[PDB]
């Protein structure tokens, strides 16, 4: 299987755990907010792109070299 | 009498490159003149070579540049040399202009070589702008569009002139073919003006870093400055090598590897880096015509340095306050450059306006004031 | 700016007690930081000479003053090209920094400015 | 040293001939040297290294 | 001494030698752009029938 | 304002004797190590403020502007961005 | 602009060709061609590459002629002026999947798959962007993202919504050299291949650069000696002044 699957998982649970938590919390909030009615007629709809970017940027920093080492 | 002096043709060369009497104390900032001559020679050689393989028709232009990259022997080198030397030409010209402003090279009796110099600078901008369009990638097309539309600001006839420059209603084949012809011509015009500013300089000779006369102590141009010029030639060629062979695309925009598409507009249309300060000055003024005037004035204002510098002493070597002001002026010019390529967003909008005011106030307020005060400090200070 | 201008303005400052109290110390520091004395120059050696007026003033210098100025220019040029500073007796001491040229240029300019005025006289 | 000077350096015709002959030798040897060095630092990566499989 | 002069001519000579070798490399690589490009060299083969061609 | 060899336009020179030695008689790199260390240090020390002050000021300005701009385009900066436009 | 509008910036991966003295790995180039041929070529052209370009880079003359000879190209008209087809030659360009833009867009829900010949030069990031994009489709878009119809979420793509779906899955290709074809391996190979396609002079350019660096450095050193030698009489000048 793809070596990246395991490396990414390891980096999320380990060095990028704070970022993982923030993304998780964000998704919980947004899903809950979408669940509530009259969400479609709201001014501001929050996404989790920002938190996702922070997590991915972190995972990539901790993985890039390790991944290419096993290809 | 030696043949080099006797024969009229040889004597002209002799007077410029051999017996030419130079100050004995020129520092390495006097080496940019010969680097500029080197860039001009490289651009002529590579440019004429690219012209042997390039097709100016819009249906073939971008592909002819790919053919140069892929099929022509050493075409990649000739292309990258031409493209990178255009950047080096601007580094050297900014250094040369910087030298001239710091050392007061614009003061009497060198107003005429300086004023011709300002025109050389305008010709280089036009040459480089037209050359960039020739690739006919996305930045080429969109760059041409927005820059040529600044002419629409000219009152009454503005729009008519734009259609005249395009040879149509938009940037297309007619524009590309005329830019090829003019891009080929402009470097020859530029070489003539470069020769003119040297002939004009030859009446006073070179200034020097102390700002005093060198009539007391002259050195032949050869061998002293010949061999001193070689050091910077090889330092230049090292820089050239690192870009051309190891990082040929560092100074470029990836979007110019996409063929021109009049429908799709690129994310950000920016000029080449060396034009960025003038673009920031243009953005600073909200009015279209205002912005264009400001942008042109930013170059033409160099012509008033001979007047606004009120100093009784030439150059900044001995003027601590002028040196501080010069430092701020140069760094502001670099900040303008950076602001030329940011998005039109807070807080860069207001910052660009402040930097634009500082740019102009150097010429109009600060240099006249500072130079007046330093005159008085030299006199009172040495009593 | 003309030497005349610089001299007149300086005299206005030196007259005002307040003004001189604040300007004279600044001017002395300016001169110290300027560092022309560290190349063995006198202040007047730095004045732009490529002007009809200044060429005339220099021709009117006494031969001794003229020969010494030539030497200071050559010496300073040698320090410049060598990237050295003056040491010892080559450094201009404040007491040696005399305005040897100012009187000559002020006379040249006096005539030049009077000539311009009188070229515009109107018989009343 | 006198001998060397007198033969190769004293006459400019000889000096320029020596410089050009040296340039010719340098050009040929430097080519060969760089080729070998380039092949060692990029070993197993070039077409010439994998060509044998095909 | 001759040794003293010879040293400085060695430096000058080396400089001339690298400049000569560098110019030769530059000229050769640069001018080669004018030799047939890769696409021109690709044109090389044509098959012709002979059945159609009459005698004489 | 410049003549030519023999009549350069110098005031008359008298009383200066100049001396030098042949390039072949001199060590071209004499005192190179002292120059490279001590001379360069002196020359650099004396010019340092004229570079440091403007560079540091404009770098600070840029840093503040770029950090604000980055912050305005985050979620946190929504309200301040709305006012700014 | 928001980070989303920019796209996430790709990691810097340690490519074999990174390094002043490093060529491409040609075995990776060959494998990358195989990914292009079996996956990308369905939607993307490679119009600037001719069969002859593969020869002595990824393939022998015979293998490349075999690839060319399997295809039909437009010949010159026959004697009645009727259209004819011929088998391909090494001089021929690799043919694209679609006859025109309209056909390309029709097949891709309106999106036009770009030609890949220059894509490594035409995007900030180069190989890193290609690798990041191909391997960076999350299973689920971040909560709150609304994708337009026919769009797929990919954070590396500016705006986040790309018209190209994920295409690399473990074992979509069977490499001829026995290498395990994982998503990551295939993305690495194809990114390398596309970088080569954009800049095929790469290997020669860097070797000539090495030669230039060495010669120019030596010339710079000698030019410093010669300048100092010639200038020493001026630097060493001394004066005695006796005022007249
Ligand atoms: C582009 C193409 C490549 C070609 C390269 C050409 C560039 C060469 C050139 O003009 O600059 C070299 C130039 C050396 O030239 P030089 O003829 O020995 O002295 C010129 C200065 O007027 C002499 O200035 P100085 O004697 O007062 O020395 C000042 C210099 C020290 O300069 C030294 O090299 C010593 O140090 C600094 O100013 C550094 C600032 C401090 C930062 C911390 O370097 C500088 O002095 C740069 C200072 C600029 C700020
Ligand atoms: C960045 C800001 C630079 C400020 C420079 C201040 C002076 C200094 O320290 O420089 C060292 C030196 C000081 O040299 P100097 O000649 O004044 O002093 C030599 C030593 N003494 C004083 C003993 C005689 O300055 C230069 O060499 C200045 C050259 C200016 C080139 C600038 C290029 C900018 C391009 C923008 C174009 C528009
Ligand atoms: C670029 C072309 C380089 C050609 C190199 C061929 C030899 C010329 C050379 O290096 O200079 C030696 C010669 C002479 O250098 P020189 O003038 O130092 O030598 C004269 C003194 N003797 C002969 C005693 C050594 O240069 C020239 O004659 C001019 C050619 C410049 C190159
Ligand atoms: C790249 C070009 C570099 C290659 C040429 C350099 C000369 C090679 C060695 C030859 C040499 O040193 O001999 C001198 C020739 O130099 C010369 O006659 C020329 C001296 C320096 C060469 C180029 C001058 C550059 C100045 C301006 C740069 C312009 C750039 C714009 C395109 C003559 O030595 P001698 O004459 O001192 O006497 C000494 C007694 N015969
Ligand atoms: C126009 C741009 C001028 C800048 C020159 C930079 C190098 C360009 C040459 C190509 C190159 O990389 O040459 C290398 C050697 O470097 C070198 O030796 C070249 C560096 C030398 C720099 C200065 C020398 C002369 C430059 C300009 C003079 C022009 C007048 C005559 C043309 C490779 O070597 P190779 O294997 O490709 O070489 C073939 C024969 N072995
Ligand atoms: C069946 C369709 C399809 C396949 C298979 C496919 N692509 Fe694409 N690709 C597209 C479409 C459509 C776009 C345009 C996406 C857009 O602009 O929204 C695209 C865009 C791209 C882009 C550019 C994205 C950008 O920045 O503009 C790259 C690079 C790319 N593809 C590479 C590949 C590679 C490498 C492969 C396979 C190994 C591949 N594609 C497979 C349809 C495909
Ligand atoms: C193609 C562009 C140019 C070339 C090839 C060129 C070349 C030269 C050369 C060889 C010199 C004498 C040596 C030196 O001082 O460096 C010189 C001096 C000068 N140039 Fe330029 N120049 C160019 C552009 C400019 C520009 C744009 C300006 C002004 C805006 C300018 C103004 C001057 C001045 C004032 C001098 C005299 C400086 C002095 O010695 O004190 N030049 N130029
Ligand atoms: C001052 C001299 C010159 C400058 C500053 C200059 C600048 C430029 C620039 C910036 C480009 C765009 C390069 C790219 O990104 O690909 C270009 C392209 C071009 N120039 Fe010039 N140029 C000069 C002289 C010449 C001359 C004399 C010719 C003779 C025809 C010429 C022919 C070309 C051609 C054919 C192209 C298009 C091919 C290409 O993009 O490489 N140039 N030039
Ligand atoms: C820099 C590129 C190299 C090519 C040289 C440029 C070509 C164009 C130069 C000719 C323009 C006329 O240039 C003019 O020529 C004459 C003689 O040549 C010079 O005249 C100078 O040298 C001669 C002897 O060398 C003296 O008689 C004279 O006293 C002195 O002024 C002028 O100072 C110069 O301004």
TrEMBL record, chain A:
GO CC, any one term: mitochondrial intermembrane space
GO molecular function annotation: quinol-cytochrome-c reductase activity
Disulfide bond entries: 16-58, 26-48
Superkingdom field: Eukaryota
Compartment(s): Mitochondrion inner membrane
UniProt-listed GO biological process terms: mitochondrial electron transport, ubiquinol to cytochrome c
Signal peptide per UniProt: none
Record key words, sorted: Electron transport, Membrane, Mitochondrion, Mitochondrion inner membrane, Respiratory chain, Transport
Boundaries of every Ubiquinol-cytochrome C reductase hinge domain copy: 2-71
Family recorded in the similarity comment: Belongs to the UQCRH/QCR6 family.
The protein, known as: YALI0F24673p
Organism: Yarrowia lipolytica (strain CLIB 122 / E 150)
Residues of the full protein shown: 66 to 136 of 137
Automatic annotation (TrEMBL), chain E:
Subcellular location: Mitochondrion inner membrane
Residue ranges crossing the lipid bilayer per the database entry: 6-27
Similarity annotation: Belongs to the Rieske iron-sulfur protein family.
General remark: The Rieske protein is a high potential 2Fe-2S protein.
UniProt protein name: Cytochrome b-c1 complex subunit Rieske, mitochondrial
Annotated organism of origin: Yarrowia lipolytica (strain CLIB 122 / E 150) (Yeast)
Residues of the full protein shown: 58 to 113 of 225
UniProtKB/TrEMBL annotation, chain F:
CC per GO annotation: mitochondrial inner membrane; respiratory chain complex III
One Pfam family cited in the UniProt record for this chain: UcrQ
Residues annotated as signal peptide: none
One GO process term, biological-process aspect: mitochondrial electron transport, ubiquinol to cytochrome c
Keyword flag Disulfide bond: no
Topological type in the membrane: Single-pass membrane protein
Keywords linked to the UniProt accession: Electron transport, Membrane, Mitochondrion, Mitochondrion inner membrane, Respiratory chain, Transmembrane, Transmembrane helix, Transport
Keyword Cell inner membrane: no
Record localization: Mitochondrion inner membrane
Recorded family membership: Belongs to the UQCRQ/QCR8 family.
Functional summary from the UniProt entry: Component of the ubiquinol-cytochrome c oxidoreductase, a multisubunit transmembrane complex that is part of the mitochondrial electron transport chain which drives oxidative phosphorylation. The complex plays an important role in the uptake of multiple carbon sources present in different host niches.
Self-association and partners: Component of the ubiquinol-cytochrome c oxidoreductase (cytochrome b-c1 complex, complex III, CIII), a multisubunit enzyme composed of 3 respiratory subunits cytochrome b, cytochrome c1 and Rieske protein, 2 core protein subunits, and additional low-molecular weight protein subunits. The complex exists as an obligatory dimer and forms supercomplexes (SCs) in the inner mitochondrial membrane with cytochrome c oxidase (complex IV, CIV).
Listed name of the protein: Cytochrome b-c1 complex subunit 8
Organism of provenance: Yarrowia lipolytica (strain CLIB 122 / E 150)
UniProtKB/TrEMBL annotation, chain G:
Protein keywords: Electron transport, Heme, Iron, Membrane, Metal-binding, Mitochondrion, Mitochondrion inner membrane, Respiratory chain, Translocase, Transmembrane, Transmembrane helix, Transport
Binding site for heme c: 40, 43-44, 123, 129, 163-164
Stretches the record annotates as Disordered: 69-90
Cofactor(s) the protein requires to work: heme c
The keyword Chloroplast is assigned to this record: no
EC code(s) of this entry: 7.1.1.8
EC class of the enzyme, as a word: translocase
Cofactor note: Binds 1 heme c group covalently per subunit.
Ranges of compositional bias, category Acidic residues: 69-80
GO molecular function annotations of the record: heme binding; metal ion binding; quinol-cytochrome-c reductase activity
Record-level GO cellular component terms: mitochondrial inner membrane; respiratory chain complex III
Cytochrome c domain segment(s): 27-198
Subcellular location(s) per record: Mitochondrion inner membrane
Catalytic activity: a quinol + 2 Fe(III)-[cytochrome c](out) = a quinone + 2 Fe(II)-[cytochrome c](out) + 2 H(+)(out)
Family: Belongs to the cytochrome c family.
Name of this protein: quinol--cytochrome-c reductase
Naturally occurring in which organism (per UniProt): Yarrowia lipolytica (strain CLIB 122 / E 150)
């Amino acid at each position: 299987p793809d070596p990246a699957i395991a490396l990414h998982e390891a980096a999320a649970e380990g060095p990028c755990h704070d970022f993982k938590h923030h993304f998780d919390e964000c998704v919980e909030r947004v899903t809950k907010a979408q669940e509530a009615e009259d969400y479609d007629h709201a001014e501001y709809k929050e996404d989790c792109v920002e938190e996702f970017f922070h997590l991915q940027h972190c995972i990539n920093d901790n993985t890039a070299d390790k991944l290419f080492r096993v290809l | 009498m030696a043949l080099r002096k006797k024969n009229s043709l040889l004597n002209m060369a002799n007077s410029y490159v051999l017996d030419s009497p130079q100050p004995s104390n020129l520092n390495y900032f006097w080496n940019f003149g010969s680097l500029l001559a080197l860039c001009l020679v490289i651009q002529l050689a590579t440019g004429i070579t690219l012209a042997m393989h390039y097709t100016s028709h819009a249906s073939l232009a971008f592909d002819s540049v790919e053919h140069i990259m892929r099929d022509v022997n050493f075409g990649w080198f000739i292309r990258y040399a031409h493209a990178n030397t255009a950047s080096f030409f601007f580094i050297c010209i900014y250094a040369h202009m910087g030298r001239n402003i710091y050392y007061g090279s614009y003061k009497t009796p060198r107003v005429l070589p300086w004023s011709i110099g300002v025109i050389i600078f305008l010709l280089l901008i036009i040459t480089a702008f037209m050359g960039y369009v020739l690739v006919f990638g996305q930045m080429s097309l969109w760059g041409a569009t927005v820059i040529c539309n600044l002419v629409s600001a000219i009152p009454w006839l503005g729009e008519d002139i734009v259609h005249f420059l395009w040879g149509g209603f938009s940037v297309g084949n007619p524009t590309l073919q005329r830019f090829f012809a003019l891009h080929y011509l402009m470097p020859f015009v530029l070489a003539v003006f470069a020769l003119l500013h040297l002939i004009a300089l030859h009446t006073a000779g070179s200034s020097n870093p102390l700002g005093i006369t060198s009539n007391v102590d002259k050195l032949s141009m050869h061998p002293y400055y010949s061999f001193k010029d070689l050091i910077t030639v090889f330092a230049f060629l090292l820089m050239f090598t690192l870009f051309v062979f190891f990082s040929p695309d560092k100074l470029g925009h990836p979007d110019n590897y996409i063929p021109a598409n009049p429908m799709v507009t690129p994310a950000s249309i920016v000029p080449e880096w060396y034009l960025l300060p003038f673009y920031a000055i243009l953005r600073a003024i909200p009015d279209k015509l205002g912005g264009v005037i400001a942008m042109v004035a930013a170059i033409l204002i160099l012509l008033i340095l001979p007047i606004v510098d009120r100093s009784i002493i030439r150059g900044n070597a001995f003027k601590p306050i002028s040196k501080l002001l010069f430092g701020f002026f140069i760094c502001n010019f670099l900040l303008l450059g950076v602001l030329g390529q940011v998005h039109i967003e807070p807080p860069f909008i207001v910052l660009g306006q402040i930097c634009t005011i500082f740019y102009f106030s150097y010429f109009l307020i600060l240099l006249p004031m500072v130079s007046t005060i330093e005159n008085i400090f030299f006199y009172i200070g040495s009593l | 700016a003309s030497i005349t201008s610089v001299v007149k303005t300086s005299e206005l400052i030196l007259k005002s007690p307040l003004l001189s109290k604040i300007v004279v110390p600044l001017a002395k520091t300016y001169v110290k930081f300027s560092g022309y004395r560290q190349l063995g120059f006198k202040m007047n050696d730095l004045i732009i000479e490529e002007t009809p007026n200044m060429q005339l003033a220099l021709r009117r210098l006494p031969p001794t003053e003229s020969y010494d100025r030539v030497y200071r220019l050559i010496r300073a040029t040698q320090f410049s090209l060598s990237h050295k500073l003056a040491t010892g007796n080559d450094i201009t001491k404040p007491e040696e920094d005399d305005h040897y040229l100012i009187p000559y240029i002020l006379d040249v300019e006096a005539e030049a400015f009077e000539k311009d005025a009188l070229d515009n006289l109107e018989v009343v | 040293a006198t001998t060397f000077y007198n033969v190769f350096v004293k006459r400019n015709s000889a000096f320029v001939a020596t410089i050009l002959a040296s340039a010719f030798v340098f050009d040929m040897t430097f080519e060969t040297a760089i080729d070998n060095f380039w092949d060692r630092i990029n070993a197993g990566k070039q077409w010439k290294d994998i060509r044998h499989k095909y | 001494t001759d040794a003293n002069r010879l040293f400085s001519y060695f430096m000058i000579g080396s400089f001339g030698m690298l400049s000569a070798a560098g110019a030769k490399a530059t000229v050769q690589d640069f001018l080669s752009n004018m030799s047939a490009s890769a696409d021109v060299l690709a044109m090389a083969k044509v098959e012709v029938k002979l059945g159609a061609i009459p005698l004489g | 304002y410049m003549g030519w060899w023999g009549h350069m336009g110098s005031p008359p020179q008298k009383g200066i004797a100049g001396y030098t030695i042949s390039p072949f008689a001199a060590r071209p790199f004499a005192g190179v190590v002292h120059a490279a260390i001590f001379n360069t240090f002196r020359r650099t020390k004396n010019q340092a403020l004229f570079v440091i002050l403007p560079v540091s000021f404009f770098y600070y300005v840029w840093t503040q502007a770029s950090e604000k701009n980055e912050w305005l385009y985050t979620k946190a900066g929504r309200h301040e961005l709305a006012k700014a436009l | 602009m928001t980070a989303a509008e920019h796209g996430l910036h790709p990691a810097e991966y340690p490519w074999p060709q990174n390094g002043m003295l490093s060529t491409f790995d040609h075995a990776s180039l060959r494998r990358g061609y195989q990914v292009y041929k079996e996956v990308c070529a369905a939607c993307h052209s490679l119009d600037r590459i001719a069969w002859r370009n593969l020869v002595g880079v990824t393939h022998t003359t015979d293998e490349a002629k075999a690839f060319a000879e399997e295809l039909e190209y437009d010949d010159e008209p026959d004697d009645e002026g009727n259209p004819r087809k011929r088998p391909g030659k090494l001089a021929d360009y690799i043919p694209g999947p679609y006859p025109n833009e309209q056909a390309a867009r029709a097949a891709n829900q309106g999106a036009l798959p770009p030609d890949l010949s220059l894509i490594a030069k035409a995007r900030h990031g180069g190989a890193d962007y290609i690798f990041a994009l191909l391997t960076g489709y999350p299973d689920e878009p971040p909560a709150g993202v609304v994708l337009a119809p026919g769009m797929n979420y990919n954070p590396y793509f500016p705006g986040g919504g790309i018209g190209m779906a994920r295409t690399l899955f473990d074992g979509v290709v069977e490499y001829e050299d026995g290498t395990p074809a994982t998503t990551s391996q295939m993305a690495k190979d194809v990114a390398a291949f596309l970088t080569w396609a954009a800049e095929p002079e790469h290997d020669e350019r860097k070797k000539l650069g090495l030669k230039a660096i060495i010669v120019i450095s030596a010339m710079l050193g000698l030019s410093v000696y010669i300048k100092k030698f010639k200038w020493s009489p001026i630097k060493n000048r001394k004066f005695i002044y006796n005022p007249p």
